[PDB]
């Protein structure tokens, strides 16, 4: 959908990345260099995520789990164990 400041205001559903021109994806034009919100180089240096902290984006092939922690994999990625950016699924 549309997101960002190309795409009134939004920020994407299941917080993906919103590319510079104001769509939302999970794919390097998206997430990579083209990224505006939630891109991949804005995981935390200590790797949280979740309400806590702002639901801060996680890093290429790394989800969110429910336990608030980015990191790849089953353990974070697979439905149940993750809250967004959900990845083997
Ligand atoms: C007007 C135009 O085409 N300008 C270019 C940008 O739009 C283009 O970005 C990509 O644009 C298309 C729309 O043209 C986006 O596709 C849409 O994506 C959403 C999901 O986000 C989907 O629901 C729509 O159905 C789909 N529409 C079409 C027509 O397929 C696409 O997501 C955009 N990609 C990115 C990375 O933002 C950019 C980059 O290719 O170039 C402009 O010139």
Request: hydrophobic share 10%; with cysteine.
């Given at each position: 959908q549309?997101?960002?400041?190309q795409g009134g205001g939004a920020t994407c559903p299941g917080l993906r990345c919103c590319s510079i021109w104001?769509?939302?994806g999970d794919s390097e034009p998206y997430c990579g260099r083209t990224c505006e919100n939630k891109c991949w180089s804005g995981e935390r240096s200590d790797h949280r995520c979740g309400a806590a902290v702002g639901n801060p984006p996680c890093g290429q092939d790394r989800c969110c789990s429910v336990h608030g922690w980015?990191?790849?994999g089953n353990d974070y990625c697979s439905?149940?164990?993750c809250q967004y950016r959900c990845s083997s699924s």
């Amino acid at each position: 959908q549309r997101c960002g400041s190309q795409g009134g205001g939004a920020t994407c559903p299941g917080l993906r990345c919103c590319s510079i021109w104001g769509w939302c994806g999970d794919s390097e034009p998206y997430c990579g260099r083209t990224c505006e919100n939630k891109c991949w180089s804005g995981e935390r240096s200590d790797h949280r995520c979740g309400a806590a902290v702002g639901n801060p984006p996680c890093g290429q092939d790394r989800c969110c789990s429910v336990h608030g922690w980015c990191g790849g994999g089953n353990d974070y990625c697979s439905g149940g164990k993750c809250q967004y950016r959900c990845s083997s699924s």
